[PDB]
């Protein structure tokens, strides 16, 4: 019997504008009690790497496709903005969802927040929150 120790450590329809949400909802952040983050998050700012995927999808589309960076990946709608933190909860940052150039291919989003309280060791378990958002077709050419 080989033991170890025990160490204690929903959106709505959006147009093509930019919505900045300051979130103070029921974030768990499952530490012991009164979790001070000690390096706070001010603005998370997603929908940047979705554009940094979408412009190479255009460029990937420019020649014939042979899965150079499109190989079964459904990570457009994932929106995995990893919130890295340092060492009873705290309010979340400003969103700035900022849909000014994004495809109609997605109809959902998620997130992941690194819950961290490190004492001379490596990092810890990590908590993820999804967000369902629909988009409005405001204009076409």
């Amino acid at each position: 019997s080989n033991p170890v120790e025990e160490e204690a450590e929903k959106m709505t329809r959006n147009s093509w504008m930019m919505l900045d949400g300051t979130k103070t909802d029921f974030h768990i952040t499952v530490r012991n009690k009164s979790l001070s983050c000690a390096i706070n998050h001010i603005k998370i700012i997603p929908m940047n790497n979705i554009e940094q995927m979408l412009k190479p999808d255009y460029w990937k589309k420019m020649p014939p496709d042979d899965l150079y960076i499109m190989e079964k990946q459904l990570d457009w709608l994932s929106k995995s903005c990893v919130r890295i933190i340092k060492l009873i909860t705290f309010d979340l940052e400003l969103d700035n969802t900022a849909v000014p150039f994004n495809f109609t291919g997605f109809d959902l989003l998620i997130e992941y927040g690194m819950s961290a309280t490190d004492e001379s060791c490596i990092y810890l378990k990590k908590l993820s929150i999804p967000y369902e958002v629909t988009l409005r077709r405001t204009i076409e050419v």
Side-chain angles (χ1 to χ4, degrees), residues 1-9 21 38 46-64 98-100 104-106 111 113 116 123-141:
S1 291
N2 206 350
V4 292
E5 60 87 20
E6 190 276 331
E7 186 46 62
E9 309 106 357
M47 295 296 172
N48 172 267
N49 290 318
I50 305 307
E51 309 196 348
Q52 302 198 31
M53 182 305 298
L54 197 84
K55 187 85 171 177
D57 176 58
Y58 283 150
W59 272 65
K60 95 75 242 193
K61 186 296 169 187
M62 177 284 301
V99 63
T104 193
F106 80 103
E111 210 192 337
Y123 273 92
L124 311 181
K125 68 169 169 279
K126 179 161 165 64
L127 268 298
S128 168
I129 297 169
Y131 293 101
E132 276 178 25
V133 55
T134 61
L135 209 76
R136 297 275 197 220
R137 179 66 66 192
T138 191
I139 193 66
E140 288 191 357
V141 297

